Subunit: 333 residues, 4 copies
Amino acid sequence: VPKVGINGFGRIGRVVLRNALETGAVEVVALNDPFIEPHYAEYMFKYDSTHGRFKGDIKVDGKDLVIDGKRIKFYQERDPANIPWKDSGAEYIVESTGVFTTTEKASAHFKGGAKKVIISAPSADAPMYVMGVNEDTYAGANVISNASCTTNCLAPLAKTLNDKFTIVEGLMTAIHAYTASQKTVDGPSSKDWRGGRAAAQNLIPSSTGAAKAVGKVIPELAGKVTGMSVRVPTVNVSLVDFTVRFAKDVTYDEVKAAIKEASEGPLKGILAYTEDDIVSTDILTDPHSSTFDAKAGIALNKNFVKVMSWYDNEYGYSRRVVDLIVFVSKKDA
Amino acid sequence: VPKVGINGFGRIGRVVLRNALETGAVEVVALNDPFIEPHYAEYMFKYDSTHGRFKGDIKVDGKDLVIDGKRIKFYQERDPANIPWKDSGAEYIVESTGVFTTTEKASAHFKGGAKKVIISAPSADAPMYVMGVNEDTYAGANVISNASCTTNCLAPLAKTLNDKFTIVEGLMTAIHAYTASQKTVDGPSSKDWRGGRAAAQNLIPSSTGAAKAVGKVIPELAGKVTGMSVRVPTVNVSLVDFTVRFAKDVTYDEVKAAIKEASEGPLKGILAYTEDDIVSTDILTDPHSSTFDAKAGIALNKNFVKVMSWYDNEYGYSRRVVDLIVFVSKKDAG
Amino acid sequence: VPKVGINGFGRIGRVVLRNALETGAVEVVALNDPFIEPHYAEYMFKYDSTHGRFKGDIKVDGKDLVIDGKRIKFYQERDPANIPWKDSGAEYIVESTGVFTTTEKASAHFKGGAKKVIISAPSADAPMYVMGVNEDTYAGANVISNASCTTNCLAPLAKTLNDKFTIVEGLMTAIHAYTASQKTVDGPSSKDWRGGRAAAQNLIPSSTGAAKAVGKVIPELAGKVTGMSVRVPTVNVSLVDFTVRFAKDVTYDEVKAAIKEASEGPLKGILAYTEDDIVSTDILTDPHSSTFDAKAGIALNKNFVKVMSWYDNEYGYSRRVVDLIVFVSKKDAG
Amino acid sequence: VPKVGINGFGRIGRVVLRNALETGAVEVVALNDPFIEPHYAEYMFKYDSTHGRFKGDIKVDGKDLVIDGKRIKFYQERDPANIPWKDSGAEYIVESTGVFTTTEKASAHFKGGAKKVIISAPSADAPMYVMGVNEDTYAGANVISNASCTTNCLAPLAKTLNDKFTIVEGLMTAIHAYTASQKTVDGPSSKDWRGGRAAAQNLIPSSTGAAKAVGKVIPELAGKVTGMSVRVPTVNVSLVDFTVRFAKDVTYDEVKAAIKEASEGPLKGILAYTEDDIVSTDILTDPHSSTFDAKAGIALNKNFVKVMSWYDNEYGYSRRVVDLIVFVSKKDAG
Ligand SMILES: NC(=O)c1ccc[n+]([C@@H]2O[C@H](COP(=O)([O-])OP(=O)(O)OC[C@H]3O[C@@H](n4cnc5c(N)ncnc54)[C@H](O)[C@@H]3O)[C@@H](O)[C@H]2O)c1
Ligand SMILES: NC(=O)c1ccc[n+]([C@@H]2O[C@H](COP(=O)([O-])OP(=O)(O)OC[C@H]3O[C@@H](n4cnc5c(N)ncnc54)[C@H](O)[C@@H]3O)[C@@H](O)[C@H]2O)c1
Ligand SMILES: NC(=O)c1ccc[n+]([C@@H]2O[C@H](COP(=O)([O-])OP(=O)(O)OC[C@H]3O[C@@H](n4cnc5c(N)ncnc54)[C@H](O)[C@@H]3O)[C@@H](O)[C@H]2O)c1
Ligand SMILES: NC(=O)c1ccc[n+]([C@@H]2O[C@H](COP(=O)([O-])OP(=O)(O)OC[C@H]3O[C@@H](n4cnc5c(N)ncnc54)[C@H](O)[C@@H]3O)[C@@H](O)[C@H]2O)c1
């Protein structure tokens, strides 16, 4: 199985490691985060406000972590060029700092001997992939992106609807949990002015390319889909709200059938289908990219419908990072 | 000038009272709520988790409330047929209990001498009005409805866009603060299973007739608009998300100009226009029905747009209740 | 293995069922809740905003629930005297509705054939027990009380410190999650004015007898301990803050060693001891009554100390309900 | 009136500016914050999630702010030694960055022409003052501290009780709103592991010198008071929980009378007294240091009592900064 390094031991970094240990699909052999010392890393991994306590064994030994018997090297370099990935055999680097999302910045990991870099975020210039949507277009690039949590929710849904019914145009709102880039109380934000307002007290509109990025992993939809997001006071779990017009005449039951069929077939494990009366906490720690909520949507007429899909923005995306490393390593061989 | 009675001294009942006192546009002379004694009512009106402390004077004087030197009768009748509205001269009754929303149930207020009843909610069998949209169609019905907060947000915006660009079809999501019918922890809500889950910890989808009701106050949009709601962990203030297709070709700048124009003219005080980077707390205790957020919307192409508009679901709607009573009282006088 | 019926399928009722299934220490064979139909009951038990999804299997078969293959009768009786506990063999009845906490009202279960009633709350007159503190004083009463979540947190801690150091006097604050009796938005609470204010937006002082009740389960502490609570914006998990004066001289390390010793011996599974840097979510779904937080306390001097102890007010208490039934059934048989 | 500069336009800096404008007691003529450009500063000041919209008028002119007609210079210097305070005549500097809390660091402001520096936080090596407690001990130090929000709450209460009843010993818990140092989701806080956990989902214990500092502003209480903090999911407003033993015998009514008397005389505007059933939001934007909550406290016996006092940790503290500057300016002038 691929040997993995994680740069940035944050929400995504720690949850990617949970998914690695849970599945065994990759072997995380090295960790880097200059703002966290090894003993502190043990604390942050063991206790989690969102996904509950870690259920395995973890201890510090020397400057390293030991998790269920396996040693993980822990470094504290601010410059990714100084991380010696080769000492542990770390070949596939998860770049989850949030500060090295361009190909140039991410490519620093090759200095320490990395083989591939997976940016855990959209990138201005690295090719983006969404498992179940366009992984087969992978063509060997050294630095790649797994897009965003929101794109991983919308794109499997949009691909399925387009294939069956032909999307003419669509607009998305992502009703999204607050994240680490937001603030407890009103303070300065680097992304945008609204982004700094008290996270747990506000609905906060936020612009996003993640719906437009659907048009890059699904070229047939370029220029046909865009949208925005509203950050809301939940610590985790988000909801895609997708209003879309089809070329074909559909009923809503036919929309549901198309989703159900994809969830039981080509997108099983990626796109789920439910008719239960679920709320956001029911999707906590669920590893799907996208769970279509049959009862939450509505059709106005035979061509114009609203559909809704849930995603654990931390947990589903993080499993997809693992899935994308496994797939790319197969192709590289 | 119009003398008002309020049945149900809840979020809407009390916030209607603050708007009456703030504007002086109506004189509230009587209140009824069987689950609040007069001393408790003073406390509930004095302190408010959402809109801050009442800035005036209030005291209890023997079963009555006195606010800024004016006596307000206070009753505790479970049956609205037993409220002697005539004793205080209350003629226009705000029916804001949530349990008397039909013409039959709301008509009980006439037994005690009410002249008109305004149901603070959509109604199955009473005409619905949205100020700035269709109040001129009022023709003397004795039981009327002020619709919902959400319809009061969407309809003035849809009217403006329809008038200027012709709406082909539109779908709405109301991202809505939690309310009194929701629960702190997972509890029974047998008629709305999701609505029983812990309110401040969940995103909670809900169906709503509020967008379809836009096609009832704007008959030209009948069959062209519907939508749903998502209840979210805020104590107040909500956000309409409107995805709409126009028959005419538009730029987003043209959409903004149409809204700004209406806000500076025929819908002043009802529909506001902003380009500021606001968030929900900035709309707290704002009396507009609808505040169009120009930087939050987006146009995909020349006919297909998503626009967003804020509303204080408590304070905007409550000011409209006062506005509607004034308007109807004037019409009842000629 | 005792056969249990649960009356009131609420937070405590459902979490008691979770604890019964998790441990197998009792067999829940019947449930009653008039406000929940069987298909709704499956939903409310399957999905939980606080403790997550149920990991086993559950379905409805006819009017019953089937959980992990076992059939569980489900009734919908408003009057507990009409619940036919006998049909399923239910002998030990968890009275978790919140509304039948006196012996007079709780005794209604005996009509349907109950053998014992455990009130999931303090009782005005039924004897109260805290596992680890006074269950040996149980003498065969047919209606008993498992006290409150807070008493179950404070009393095992107070007993240990009293046994070792002699408590002269103590005052407690329970920093407590909000509960089902609180309100999402400012609402009517005629017997607890503060308790009606928006739960997720306020710190809400509240008086409690739960610290004085430590004086009933530990009679030597009668009149030496009381306190109050503050209800805070968390959906679950609470924290006892105990400020206490000892007759003996102690260091804070001796305080810690006494609690660690108790946690490894006589109070294992009831009182836990930690030096970790935990926060409230770390105690979610933790079955202990009391988790002493070593780093959160502080000593002013050799006789005056502040200790703090965590408790999942739903899950800890609910496991104690299961433990108490087990203990009492053993006593009933020898 | 004194001319003021503010280094650090954060929660305290902006709420200090609001208090200066509200009272006119000082004239703010310059601001510095390298992370907030002028147009961003206008937005952050105009719109506040906690205290609401700014009521006055504000605009940017070039690189400076203009607020209600007066120009305010705005700099973005990361090194306070480079702020040209003299250009605007700013003499009294509010040091509210959180990062220059020592006499050596705060002294950087003198390079730019400042006359006095008031650190908006406790300091390891500058004298701390609490208005109503020890401001008369000021004797011309050039770098002073206004202590913390929590010490400004506890000290006036502790002085009053100790003056009348003699405090033998006391322990405090500050139930405290979360602040800008905390995190929205679990993130790094290597000096305070608990302080990194999701602020709005957790109760978070924390050590604090704020209770011990009461023994520094009140030397007669040295060694007799300490405590800790629990950070909770509110955006603002905190609650002091003070458990104290007196040397004299007292009733609770006598405790109440002593607090009320102080609130009406020497501590007016500093310590408030209430018997209302208030909750945290009722203290929002209240400028008192300390609001004694009569009904929330409890006496165990004639010497052992728990008292509770509310404080808007942003607004009360900020008004005290303004008050301290006024007082120091008058003493500086004779
Ligand atoms: N949280 C989500 O829902 C989510 C979902 C999908 C993608 N993402 C993306 O994943 C990335 C990480 O997000 P997050 O939520 O985990 O953020 P986070 O703040 O929780 O974690 C980022 C971590 O990177 C560390 N770091 C900072 N500078 C560093 C450096 N120079 N070298 C190494 N480590 C450094 C920080 O200490 C922190 O622990 C971001 O790009 C984000 O946009 C986040
Ligand atoms: N809250 C909102 O945002 C909002 C906005 C627009 C409209 N509304 C509508 O306004 C109505 C009231 O909503 P609310 O949020 O104020 O609810 P609420 O629960 O806060 O208020 C209801 C009040 O009615 C009282 N009441 C109950 N039974 C009564 C009776 N028999 N006689 C007299 N009074 C009685 C209750 O004691 C309570 O004080 C509802 O129909 C709601 O749909 C609410
Ligand atoms: N939640 C806690 O933290 C906690 C902890 C310890 C003890 N308790 C006590 O346990 C009891 C239950 O509390 P809860 O938090 O589970 O409340 P809850 O509201 O979650 O549960 C009450 C349940 O009882 C049902 N009920 C109402 N009337 C009934 C009737 N006549 N017959 C049968 N069922 C009826 C309701 O439908 C509801 O499902 C209360 O007395 C409470 O004080 C609660
Ligand atoms: N918030 C409270 O309740 C409270 C109460 C009393 C005291 N305090 C104290 O006041 C101080 C500020 O607290 P806050 O809550 O306002 O924090 P905050 O983060 O809201 O404000 C800090 C401000 O200082 C600015 N800043 C950072 N580095 C700077 C530099 N080199 N030069 C100039 N400005 C810089 C930041 O941009 C930010 O605007 C802290 O010392 C805090 O302990 C806070």
